[PDB]
Design a protein around this ligand. Structure first.
Ligand SMILES: CC(C)(C)[C@H]1C(O)=C(C2=NS(=O)(=O)c3ccccc32)C(=O)N1Cc1ccc(F)c(C#N)c1
Length: 557
């Protein structure tokens, strides 16, 4: 029961990889300490392999089977359809890794018959054969961080023809089943506004609130063949076409349970018997499996009135406190149960009696005040990683714009409004690229977004209070400040000053550009405008957003 076995062949890059922050004319206006920012490369893949390779033991008790029976009972109420070749093709990102069989993501989106002819044959092969392990490519992720140095994460994904077949069999299931099985506990149904509402409401619905986040060590690595067969048995409870049942059975045996790892050069690196990071079912399976283990571990622990919020491997529990030592006892039991279930912790959990101190989906609840003085709650984070990545994206064009995703999801935050919006609107102005659509990743799915729709997207995700927030908390204001001192970012009076400029230049241009200046930078002037609902905002089609997670699922909406 080893997560992985290795041949000794190295995980190879396909293009050269920069580990050091690229510098341009713009870099120093955002960040001075360039030595603090790095990107992970293949060079560290060996250390990741070490970290993720271990023996899993799993001990499964009545709590585990009682929760699973309940989950399957809900799964039975789900009906899911097959997607046609065309539908699945249209879900393929333009930028998506090309097929080994001589065709690419754009050929797939075009419905070019060489692509579609292959896909039909991969599909046919899935129905006929249910035993033959499907090839995966193993690559090192290039992601940017601040030093404190992390090894590259491993992405494992099958060929583009298989990925389109996964969509035909399972897109509708992984879109619809998780909300039916987990109800309000399924995190990816929530906009950031909806998520802060659920957390705060959940917290207040307790007499004596206690909550903790649960950090599983390398959760993909802790997922067993058992866990992956249990997931397929949940999928199989749905009312499915028999062609769909056959495909899900085949993809489970041949791809999801495990299979061989090939590097960029086409050499054999070893064998996987855990979760693939890069398949359609990674989000949904992690979320189901985390919810099953954690739900059963709650019952073991005798946590009273448990509310859970689960996003893939990211887990928050809020429950009734039974005093501090009782709570501390509960959490150790909780941890023993998760360990037996093969989800041992990274940091051991800590009970918390202040909601603002709980981190879940890399975010904490904080509080500011809107126009009318009224307290509004919002999600924020330490902005160290988002700014490190903004620095890197200032000097290199990346196909996913972390800064755009971070503006959309953290729009109400001091740091997103003062730094990210100021910095990136100045760049789009100087290049006159306000009207040029950018790809960004929300809950793993890729979206093409026009920056000039940002005010409308922000009203819909967060409400109009996102444009009027002030009197951020002492503790939020400190963490922003300490991060700027760390990264050598200019102070927030410099950003206010810059934003007055950007605001002025955006109003200059009228149309949506003016709206952007009105709404995004109202905070920068003291003689404030009165901000009121945007007309084009309820025209925006935000169905597809906050339905489901698709991390590593190759999904474009
Ligand atoms: C755009 C980014 C900033 C990356 C966003 C996101 O898409 C994921 C996420 N994407 S994922 O599908 O890869 C995944 C898996 C597990 C946990 C989170 C995520 C994430 O954690 N994010 C930070 C986040 C999440 C929920 C929130 F309400 C708020 C706020 N306010 C902020």
């Amino acid at each position: 029961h080893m997560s992985y076995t290795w041949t000794g062949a190295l995980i190879t890059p396909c293009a050269a990889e920069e580990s050091k922050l690229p510098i341009n004319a713009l870099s120093n206006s955002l960040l001075r300490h360039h030595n603090m920012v790095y990107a992970t490369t293949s060079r560290s893949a060996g250390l990741r392999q070490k970290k993720v390779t271990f023996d899993r033991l799993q001990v499964l008790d009545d709590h585990y089977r009682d929760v699973l029976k309940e989950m399957k009972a809900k799964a039975s109420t789900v009906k899911a359809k097959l997607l046609s070749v065309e539908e699945a093709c249209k879900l393929t990102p333009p930028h998506s890794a090309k097929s080994k069989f001589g065709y690419g993501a754009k050929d797939v989106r075009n419905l070019s018959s060489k692509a579609v002819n292959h896909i039909h044959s991969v599909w046919k092969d899935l129905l006929e054969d249910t035993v033959t392990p499907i090839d995966t490519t193993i690559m090192a992720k290039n992601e940017v961080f601040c030093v404190q140095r992390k090894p590259a994460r491993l992405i494992v994904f099958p060929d583009l023809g298989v990925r389109v077949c996964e969509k035909m069999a399972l897109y509708d299931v992984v879109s619809t089943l998780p909300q039916v099985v987990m109800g309000s506990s399924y995190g990816f149904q929530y906009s950031p506004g909806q998520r802060v509402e659920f957390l705060v409401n959940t917290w207040k619905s307790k007499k004596n609130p206690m909550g903790f986040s649960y950090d599983t060590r390398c959760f993909d690595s802790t997922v067993t063949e058992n866990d992956i067969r249990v997931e397929e048995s949940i999928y199989q409870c749905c009312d499915l076409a028999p062609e769909a049942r056959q495909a899900i059975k085949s993809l489970t045996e041949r791809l999801y349970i495990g299979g061989p790892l090939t590097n960029s050069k086409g050499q054999n690196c070893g064998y996987r018997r855990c979760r693939a990071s890069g398949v359609l079912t990674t989000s949904c399976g992690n979320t189901l499996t985390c919810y099953l283990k954690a739900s059963a571990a709650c019952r073991a622990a005798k946590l009273q009135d448990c509310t859970m919020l689960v996003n893939g491997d990211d887990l928050v529990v809020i429950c009734e406190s039974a005093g501090t030592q009782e709570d501390a006892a509960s959490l150790r039991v909780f941890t023993e149960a998760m360990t037996r279930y093969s989800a041992p912790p990274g940091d051991p959990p800590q009970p918390e009696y202040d909601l603002e101190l709980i981190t879940s989906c890399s975010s904490n609840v904080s509080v500011a005040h809107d126009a009318s003085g009224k307290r509004v709650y919002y999600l924020t984070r330490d902005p160290t990683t988002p700014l490190a990545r903004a620095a890197w994206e200032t000097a290199r064009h990346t196909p996913v714009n972390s800064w755009l995703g971070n503006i959309i999801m953290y729009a109400p935050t001091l740091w997103a409004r003062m730094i990210l919006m100021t910095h990136f609107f100045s760049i789009l102005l100087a290049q006159e690229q306000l009207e040029k659509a950018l790809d960004c990743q929300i809950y793993g799915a890729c979206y093409s977004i026009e920056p000039l729709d940002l005010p409308q997207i922000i009203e819909r995700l967060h409400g109009l209070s996102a444009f009027s927030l002030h009197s951020y908390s002492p503790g939020e204001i400190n963490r922003v400040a300490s991060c700027l001192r760390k990264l050598g970012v200019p102070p927030l009076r410099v950003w206010r000053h810059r934003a007055r400029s950007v605001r002025a230049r955006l109003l200059s241009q009228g149309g949506r550009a003016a709206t952007c200046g009105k709404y995004l930078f109202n905070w920068a002037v003291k003689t404030k405008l009165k901000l009121t609902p945007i007309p084009a905002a309820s025209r925006l089609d935000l169905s597809g957003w906050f339905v489901a997670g698709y991390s590593g699922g190759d999904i474009y909406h």
